[PDB]
Amino acid sequence: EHKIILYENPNFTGKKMEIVDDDVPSFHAHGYQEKVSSVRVQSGTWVGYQYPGYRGLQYLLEKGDYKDNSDFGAPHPQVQSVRRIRDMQGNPKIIIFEQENFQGHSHELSGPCPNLKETGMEKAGSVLVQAGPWVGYEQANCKGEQFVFEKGEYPRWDSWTDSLSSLRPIK
Amino acid sequence: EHKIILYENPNFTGKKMEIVDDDVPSFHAHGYQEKVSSVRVQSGTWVGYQYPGYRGLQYLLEKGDYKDNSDFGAPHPQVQSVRRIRDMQGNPKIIIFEQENFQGHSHELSGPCPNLKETGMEKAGSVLVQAGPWVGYEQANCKGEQFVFEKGEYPRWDSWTSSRRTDSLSSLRPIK
Protein backbone atom coordinates (compact mmCIF):
# COMPACT_ATOMS: atom_id res chain seq x y z
CA GLU A 1 0.00 0.00 0.00
CA HIS A 2 1.46 3.29 -1.30
CA LYS A 3 0.85 6.26 0.99
CA ILE A 4 1.55 9.98 0.91
CA ILE A 5 0.72 12.57 3.54
CA LEU A 6 0.29 16.25 2.82
CA TYR A 7 0.58 18.91 5.53
CA GLU A 8 -0.68 22.49 5.82
CA ASN A 9 2.33 24.22 7.38
CA PRO A 10 6.06 23.58 6.89
CA ASN A 11 7.94 20.88 8.84
CA PHE A 12 4.97 18.47 8.98
CA THR A 13 2.67 20.54 11.22
CA GLY A 14 -0.95 21.65 10.86
CA LYS A 15 -4.00 19.92 9.36
CA LYS A 16 -3.27 16.90 7.13
CA MET A 17 -4.62 14.53 4.43
CA GLU A 18 -3.62 10.85 4.17
CA ILE A 19 -3.82 9.30 0.74
CA VAL A 20 -3.40 5.52 0.41
CA ASP A 21 -3.15 4.16 -3.14
CA ASP A 22 -5.94 6.27 -4.70
CA ASP A 23 -5.66 9.28 -7.08
CA VAL A 24 -7.10 12.65 -6.04
CA PRO A 25 -8.26 15.03 -8.83
CA SER A 26 -9.68 17.58 -6.40
CA PHE A 27 -8.46 18.25 -2.87
CA HIS A 28 -11.60 20.31 -2.22
CA ALA A 29 -13.80 17.35 -3.15
CA HIS A 30 -11.87 15.37 -0.52
CA GLY A 31 -12.32 18.00 2.20
CA TYR A 32 -8.89 19.64 2.02
CA GLN A 33 -9.37 23.37 1.35
CA GLU A 34 -5.92 24.50 2.59
CA LYS A 35 -2.47 25.18 1.14
CA VAL A 36 0.29 22.53 1.19
CA SER A 37 3.74 23.39 2.54
CA SER A 38 5.31 20.01 3.47
CA VAL A 39 4.97 16.48 2.10
CA ARG A 40 5.93 13.03 3.40
CA VAL A 41 6.08 10.21 0.86
CA GLN A 42 6.25 6.83 2.62
CA SER A 43 6.03 4.73 -0.52
CA GLY A 44 5.62 5.00 -4.27
CA THR A 45 6.19 7.80 -6.73
CA TRP A 46 3.61 10.58 -7.14
CA VAL A 47 3.22 13.76 -9.20
CA GLY A 48 1.46 16.65 -7.55
CA TYR A 49 -0.14 19.47 -9.54
CA GLN A 50 -0.79 23.15 -8.94
CA TYR A 51 -4.47 23.17 -10.03
CA PRO A 52 -7.31 20.56 -9.86
CA GLY A 53 -7.78 18.00 -12.64
CA TYR A 54 -3.98 17.61 -12.92
CA ARG A 55 -3.30 21.09 -14.40
CA GLY A 56 -0.61 23.69 -13.91
CA LEU A 57 2.92 23.17 -12.65
CA GLN A 58 3.93 19.53 -12.10
CA TYR A 59 6.03 18.52 -9.10
CA LEU A 60 7.59 15.06 -8.86
CA LEU A 61 7.37 13.41 -5.44
CA GLU A 62 9.55 10.35 -4.85
CA LYS A 63 9.94 8.54 -1.51
CA GLY A 64 11.22 10.88 1.19
CA ASP A 65 10.42 13.90 3.34
CA TYR A 66 9.98 17.43 2.01
CA LYS A 67 10.08 19.94 4.90
CA ASP A 68 9.34 23.04 2.86
CA ASN A 69 7.59 23.38 -0.50
CA SER A 70 10.76 24.73 -2.07
CA ASP A 71 12.01 21.15 -1.58
CA PHE A 72 9.58 19.86 -4.21
CA GLY A 73 10.08 22.76 -6.62
CA ALA A 74 6.94 24.74 -5.68
CA PRO A 75 7.13 28.59 -5.79
CA HIS A 76 4.19 28.84 -3.37
CA PRO A 77 2.18 26.36 -1.20
CA GLN A 78 -0.30 25.49 -4.01
CA VAL A 79 -1.14 21.91 -4.80
CA GLN A 80 -4.72 20.95 -5.68
CA SER A 81 -4.39 17.41 -7.11
CA VAL A 82 -2.06 14.41 -6.84
CA ARG A 83 -1.62 11.11 -8.75
CA ARG A 84 0.51 8.02 -8.43
CA ILE A 85 2.83 6.58 -11.08
CA ARG A 86 2.14 2.84 -10.90
CA ASP A 87 3.59 1.69 -14.21
CA MET A 88 7.33 1.68 -14.73
CA GLN A 89 9.19 -0.08 -17.53
CA GLY A 90 12.45 -1.99 -17.32
CA ASN A 91 15.23 -0.41 -19.36
CA PRO A 92 14.48 3.31 -19.72
CA LYS A 93 14.97 4.80 -23.19
CA ILE A 94 13.95 8.15 -24.59
CA ILE A 95 14.61 9.62 -28.01
CA ILE A 96 14.47 13.32 -28.55
CA PHE A 97 14.31 14.85 -32.04
CA GLU A 98 15.39 18.35 -33.08
CA GLN A 99 12.24 18.95 -35.06
CA GLU A 100 8.52 18.48 -34.90
CA ASN A 101 6.61 15.30 -35.62
CA PHE A 102 9.73 13.23 -35.00
CA GLN A 103 11.96 14.64 -37.76
CA GLY A 104 15.54 15.88 -37.80
CA HIS A 105 18.60 14.64 -35.91
CA SER A 106 17.78 12.19 -33.14
CA HIS A 107 19.48 11.84 -29.71
CA GLU A 108 18.81 8.67 -27.70
CA LEU A 109 19.35 8.44 -23.92
CA SER A 110 19.01 5.64 -21.33
CA GLY A 111 20.36 7.43 -18.28
CA PRO A 112 20.55 10.91 -16.67
CA CYS A 113 21.75 13.84 -18.74
CA PRO A 114 22.40 17.12 -16.87
CA ASN A 115 22.82 19.08 -20.09
CA LEU A 116 21.26 18.31 -23.49
CA LYS A 117 23.73 20.54 -25.39
CA GLU A 118 26.35 17.86 -24.76
CA THR A 119 24.53 15.52 -27.14
CA GLY A 120 24.87 18.15 -29.88
CA MET A 121 21.15 18.82 -29.45
CA GLU A 122 20.27 22.35 -30.56
CA LYS A 123 16.50 22.39 -29.86
CA ALA A 124 13.86 19.98 -28.53
CA GLY A 125 11.14 19.61 -31.17
CA SER A 126 9.49 16.28 -30.35
CA VAL A 127 10.08 13.44 -27.82
CA LEU A 128 9.52 9.70 -28.04
CA VAL A 129 9.43 7.70 -24.80
CA GLN A 130 10.01 4.00 -25.43
CA ALA A 131 10.37 3.16 -21.72
CA GLY A 132 10.18 5.22 -18.56
CA PRO A 133 8.78 7.33 -17.00
CA TRP A 134 11.33 10.10 -17.40
CA VAL A 135 11.43 13.51 -15.78
CA GLY A 136 12.60 16.55 -17.69
CA TYR A 137 13.67 19.94 -16.37
CA GLU A 138 13.52 23.43 -17.79
CA GLN A 139 17.16 24.11 -16.79
CA ALA A 140 20.51 22.32 -16.69
CA ASN A 141 21.58 20.16 -13.71
CA CYS A 142 17.98 19.12 -13.05
CA LYS A 143 16.48 22.39 -11.78
CA GLY A 144 13.55 24.63 -12.73
CA GLU A 145 10.17 23.69 -14.20
CA GLN A 146 9.43 19.95 -14.20
CA PHE A 147 7.74 17.96 -16.99
CA VAL A 148 6.89 14.24 -16.48
CA PHE A 149 7.15 12.03 -19.61
CA GLU A 150 5.37 8.70 -19.84
CA LYS A 151 5.52 5.97 -22.51
CA GLY A 152 4.06 7.60 -25.61
CA GLU A 153 4.58 10.23 -28.30
CA TYR A 154 5.12 13.96 -27.74
CA PRO A 155 4.93 15.65 -31.26
CA ARG A 156 5.23 19.33 -30.26
CA TRP A 157 6.54 21.53 -27.50
CA ASP A 158 2.99 22.04 -26.22
CA SER A 159 2.57 18.32 -25.50
CA TRP A 160 4.72 18.83 -22.41
CA THR A 161 4.44 22.61 -21.89
CA ASP A 162 9.50 25.92 -24.38
CA SER A 163 13.09 24.74 -23.60
CA LEU A 164 14.15 21.47 -21.99
CA SER A 165 17.73 21.22 -20.74
CA SER A 166 18.05 18.09 -18.56
CA LEU A 167 16.48 14.61 -18.14
CA ARG A 168 16.50 11.73 -15.63
CA PRO A 169 15.03 8.14 -15.69
CA ILE A 170 12.60 5.99 -13.70
CA LYS A 171 11.65 7.90 -10.62
CA GLU B 1 -19.26 -1.63 -13.50
CA HIS B 2 -17.60 1.22 -15.39
CA LYS B 3 -16.34 0.26 -18.83
CA ILE B 4 -15.22 2.08 -21.97
CA ILE B 5 -13.98 0.56 -25.19
CA LEU B 6 -11.75 2.37 -27.65
CA TYR B 7 -11.46 1.32 -31.29
CA GLU B 8 -8.81 1.87 -33.97
CA ASN B 9 -10.96 2.61 -37.04
CA PRO B 10 -14.34 4.41 -37.27
CA ASN B 11 -17.66 2.63 -36.65
CA PHE B 12 -16.24 0.28 -33.99
CA THR B 13 -13.89 -1.73 -36.19
CA GLY B 14 -10.20 -2.64 -35.91
CA LYS B 15 -8.02 -3.45 -32.88
CA LYS B 16 -9.50 -2.49 -29.49
CA MET B 17 -8.85 -1.88 -25.85
CA GLU B 18 -11.44 -2.35 -23.12
CA ILE B 19 -10.87 -0.42 -19.88
CA VAL B 20 -12.71 -1.48 -16.73
CA ASP B 21 -12.84 1.08 -13.87
CA ASP B 22 -9.09 1.94 -13.94
CA ASP B 23 -7.38 5.13 -15.20
CA VAL B 24 -4.86 4.93 -18.04
CA PRO B 25 -2.10 7.61 -18.15
CA SER B 26 -0.35 5.88 -21.04
CA PHE B 27 -1.94 3.86 -23.85
CA HIS B 28 1.49 2.75 -25.00
CA ALA B 29 2.28 1.34 -21.57
CA HIS B 30 -0.95 -0.62 -21.84
CA GLY B 31 -0.02 -2.04 -25.24
CA TYR B 32 -2.15 0.24 -27.42
CA GLN B 33 0.15 2.01 -29.90
CA GLU B 34 -2.58 2.95 -32.44
CA LYS B 35 -4.87 5.90 -33.17
CA VAL B 36 -8.45 6.09 -31.82
CA SER B 37 -11.35 6.86 -34.18
CA SER B 38 -14.47 5.48 -32.42
CA VAL B 39 -15.46 5.11 -28.75
CA ARG B 40 -18.19 3.13 -26.95
CA VAL B 41 -18.97 4.20 -23.37
CA GLN B 42 -21.07 1.57 -21.61
CA SER B 43 -21.05 3.20 -18.19
CA GLY B 44 -19.65 6.18 -16.34
CA THR B 45 -18.23 9.52 -17.46
CA TRP B 46 -14.68 9.76 -18.75
CA VAL B 47 -12.34 12.42 -20.03
CA GLY B 48 -9.94 11.45 -22.82
CA TYR B 49 -6.81 13.45 -23.60
CA GLN B 50 -4.72 14.08 -26.70
CA TYR B 51 -1.30 13.33 -25.12
CA PRO B 52 -0.11 10.94 -22.34
CA GLY B 53 -0.26 11.93 -18.66
CA TYR B 54 -3.54 13.79 -19.27
CA ARG B 55 -2.16 16.63 -21.47
CA GLY B 56 -3.38 18.39 -24.58
CA LEU B 57 -6.95 18.71 -25.81
CA GLN B 58 -9.63 17.32 -23.43
CA TYR B 59 -12.60 15.31 -24.71
CA LEU B 60 -15.61 14.61 -22.53
CA LEU B 61 -17.03 11.11 -22.97
CA GLU B 62 -20.43 10.42 -21.42
CA LYS B 63 -22.43 7.20 -21.83
CA GLY B 64 -23.12 6.45 -25.50
CA ASP B 65 -21.60 5.52 -28.85
CA TYR B 66 -19.26 7.75 -30.86
CA LYS B 67 -18.93 6.42 -34.44
CA ASP B 68 -16.34 8.91 -35.63
CA ASN B 69 -13.86 11.00 -33.66
CA SER B 70 -15.56 14.19 -34.78
CA ASP B 71 -18.40 12.97 -32.51
CA PHE B 72 -16.26 13.53 -29.41
CA GLY B 73 -14.74 16.82 -30.60
CA ALA B 74 -11.40 15.46 -31.80
CA PRO B 75 -9.79 17.28 -34.78
CA HIS B 76 -7.51 14.28 -35.26
CA PRO B 77 -7.92 10.70 -33.96
CA GLN B 78 -5.18 11.14 -31.37
CA VAL B 79 -6.02 10.08 -27.80
CA GLN B 80 -3.19 8.84 -25.55
CA SER B 81 -4.72 8.80 -22.03
CA VAL B 82 -8.14 8.47 -20.41
CA ARG B 83 -9.54 8.94 -16.88
CA ARG B 84 -12.90 8.46 -15.16
CA ILE B 85 -14.86 11.07 -13.26
CA ARG B 86 -16.03 9.23 -10.16
CA ASP B 87 -17.03 12.02 -7.79
CA MET B 88 -20.02 14.18 -8.63
CA GLN B 89 -21.70 16.62 -6.24
CA GLY B 90 -25.42 17.16 -5.75
CA ASN B 91 -26.56 20.64 -6.70
CA PRO B 92 -24.11 22.02 -9.28
CA LYS B 93 -23.00 25.62 -8.80
CA ILE B 94 -20.24 27.59 -10.49
CA ILE B 95 -19.30 31.21 -10.06
CA ILE B 96 -17.35 33.00 -12.73
CA PHE B 97 -15.63 36.34 -12.09
CA GLU B 98 -14.66 38.99 -14.61
CA GLN B 99 -11.04 39.43 -13.52
CA GLU B 100 -8.20 37.40 -11.97
CA ASN B 101 -7.95 36.03 -8.43
CA PHE B 102 -11.72 36.12 -7.98
CA GLN B 103 -12.25 39.86 -8.29
CA GLY B 104 -14.76 41.95 -10.24
CA HIS B 105 -18.40 41.31 -11.08
CA SER B 106 -19.54 37.78 -10.32
CA HIS B 107 -21.97 35.59 -12.32
CA GLU B 108 -23.38 32.45 -10.63
CA LEU B 109 -24.88 29.53 -12.58
CA SER B 110 -26.52 26.24 -11.58
CA GLY B 111 -27.64 25.01 -15.00
CA PRO B 112 -26.57 25.09 -18.68
CA CYS B 113 -25.76 28.42 -20.31
CA PRO B 114 -25.28 28.42 -24.11
CA ASN B 115 -23.97 32.00 -24.09
CA LEU B 116 -22.13 33.78 -21.27
CA LYS B 117 -22.73 37.25 -22.74
CA GLU B 118 -26.35 36.87 -21.62
CA THR B 119 -25.27 37.14 -17.99
CA GLY B 120 -23.69 40.50 -18.77
CA MET B 121 -20.30 38.75 -18.53
CA GLU B 122 -17.62 40.42 -20.68
CA LYS B 123 -14.47 38.36 -20.07
CA ALA B 124 -13.77 35.26 -17.94
CA GLY B 125 -10.95 36.01 -15.51
CA SER B 126 -11.29 33.37 -12.77
CA VAL B 127 -13.69 30.49 -11.97
CA LEU B 128 -14.89 29.02 -8.69
CA VAL B 129 -16.53 25.60 -8.75
CA GLN B 130 -18.58 24.96 -5.61
CA ALA B 131 -20.17 21.78 -6.97
CA GLY B 132 -19.81 19.91 -10.22
CA PRO B 133 -18.10 18.83 -12.36
CA TRP B 134 -18.94 21.34 -15.10
CA VAL B 135 -17.86 21.34 -18.73
CA GLY B 136 -16.94 24.57 -20.49
CA TYR B 137 -16.63 25.26 -24.22
CA GLU B 138 -14.61 27.80 -26.17
CA GLN B 139 -17.63 28.75 -28.31
CA ALA B 140 -21.36 29.45 -27.87
CA ASN B 141 -23.98 26.67 -28.00
CA CYS B 142 -21.56 24.13 -26.48
CA LYS B 143 -19.10 23.68 -29.36
CA GLY B 144 -15.34 24.05 -29.86
CA GLU B 145 -12.51 23.38 -27.41
CA GLN B 146 -13.59 21.60 -24.19
CA PHE B 147 -12.39 22.39 -20.64
CA VAL B 148 -13.47 20.19 -17.68
CA PHE B 149 -13.91 22.01 -14.33
CA GLU B 150 -13.85 20.16 -11.02
CA LYS B 151 -14.56 21.38 -7.48
CA GLY B 152 -11.82 23.86 -6.70
CA GLU B 153 -10.35 27.25 -7.61
CA TYR B 154 -9.25 28.46 -11.06
CA PRO B 155 -7.44 31.87 -10.53
CA ARG B 156 -6.26 32.59 -14.11
CA TRP B 157 -7.21 31.54 -17.64
CA ASP B 158 -4.13 29.32 -17.77
CA SER B 159 -5.64 27.14 -15.01
CA TRP B 160 -8.06 25.76 -17.62
CA THR B 161 -5.94 25.82 -20.78
CA SER B 162 -3.59 22.75 -20.75
CA SER B 163 -3.12 23.90 -24.26
CA ARG B 164 -2.93 27.64 -23.56
CA ARG B 165 -4.38 28.27 -27.03
CA THR B 166 -7.56 30.26 -26.23
CA ASP B 167 -8.47 32.50 -23.28
CA SER B 168 -12.20 32.73 -24.12
CA LEU B 169 -14.98 30.62 -22.61
CA SER B 170 -18.47 31.09 -24.07
CA SER B 171 -20.72 28.27 -22.78
CA LEU B 172 -21.07 25.93 -19.75
CA ARG B 173 -23.00 22.79 -18.77
CA PRO B 174 -23.38 20.83 -15.46
CA ILE B 175 -22.79 17.32 -14.12
CA LYS B 176 -21.88 15.12 -17.00
Return the sign of the alpha-carbon dihedral for residues B152, B156, B162, B166: positive
CA-based radius of gyration for chain B:
17
Minimal-distance CA residue of chain A relative to B158: A56
CB contact under 8 A, A52 and B152: yes
Could you say which of A23, A56, A159 has the minimum Cβ distance to residue B56? A159
Selected residue of A28, A51, A148 to mutate for chain B interface (largest B Cβ count, 10 A): A51
User: How many angstroms separate the CA of residue A168 from the nearest CA in chain B?
Assistant: 17
CB contact under 8 A, B51 and A23: no
Residues from chain B contacting residue A160 (CB–CB below 8 Å) = 51, 55
Alpha-carbon distance A63 to A48, whole Å? 13
DSSP state of B112: -
A25/B163 touch (CB, cutoff 8 Å), yes or no: no
CA distance B173 to B62: 13
Instruction: Determine the residue among A35, A128, A148, A159 to mutate to test chain B binding: the one whose Cβ has the most chain B Cβ atoms within 10 Å.
Output: A159
**Contact state of A149 with B53 under an 8 Å Cβ cutoff:** yes
Distances (CA, A) of B163 to B56, B65, B166: 6, 26, 8
Nearest to B55 among A83, A85, A159 (CB): A159
Q: Give the rounded distance of the alpha carbon of A123 from its chain centre.
A: 21
Cβ atoms B64, B41 nearer than 8 A: yes
Distances, alpha carbon B68 to alpha carbons A145, B40, B134, in Å: 37, 11, 24
- A chain contacts of residue B80, beta-carbon cutoff 8 Å: 152-153
Resolution (A): 2.8
Give B83's strand partners.
B47
Walk me through the domains of chain A, giving residue ranges and CATH numbers: 2-87 (2.60.20.10), 92-170 (2.60.20.10)
What's the CA gap between B121 and B74, in Å, rounded? 28
- Chain A: give the shortest CA distance to residue B141, in Å: 24
Pairwise CB contact (< 8 Å): B52 & A152 = yes
Q: Which of B26, B54, B85 sits opposite A87 (nearest CB)?
A: B26
Q: Name the residue of chain A whose CA is nearest to B54's CA.
A: A54
b vs e for A43-72, b when ≥16 Cβ sit within 10 Å of the residue's Cβ? ebbbbbbbbbbbbbbbbbbeeeebeebebb
- Whether the bond between A133 and the residue before it is cis, its omega within 30 degrees of 0, is yes
Three-class secondary structure assignment of chain A: CCEEEEEEECCCEEEEEEEECCCECCCHHHCCCCCCCEEEECCCEEEEEEECCCEEEEEEECCEEECCHHHHCCCCCCCCEEEEECCCCCCCEEEEEEEHHHEEEEEEECCCECCHHHHCCCCCCEEEEEECCEEEEEECCCEEEEEEECCEEECCHHHCCCCCCEEECCC
CA-based nearest distance B33→chain A, Å? 8
B152 phi/psi in degrees, rounded to 5? 165, -160
* Most B CBs within 10 Å, among A95, A134, A158, A160, to test the B interface: A158
The breaks in chain A (C to N more than 2.5 Å) occur after 161
Q: Give how far B74 is from chain A: nearest CA, Å.
A: 16
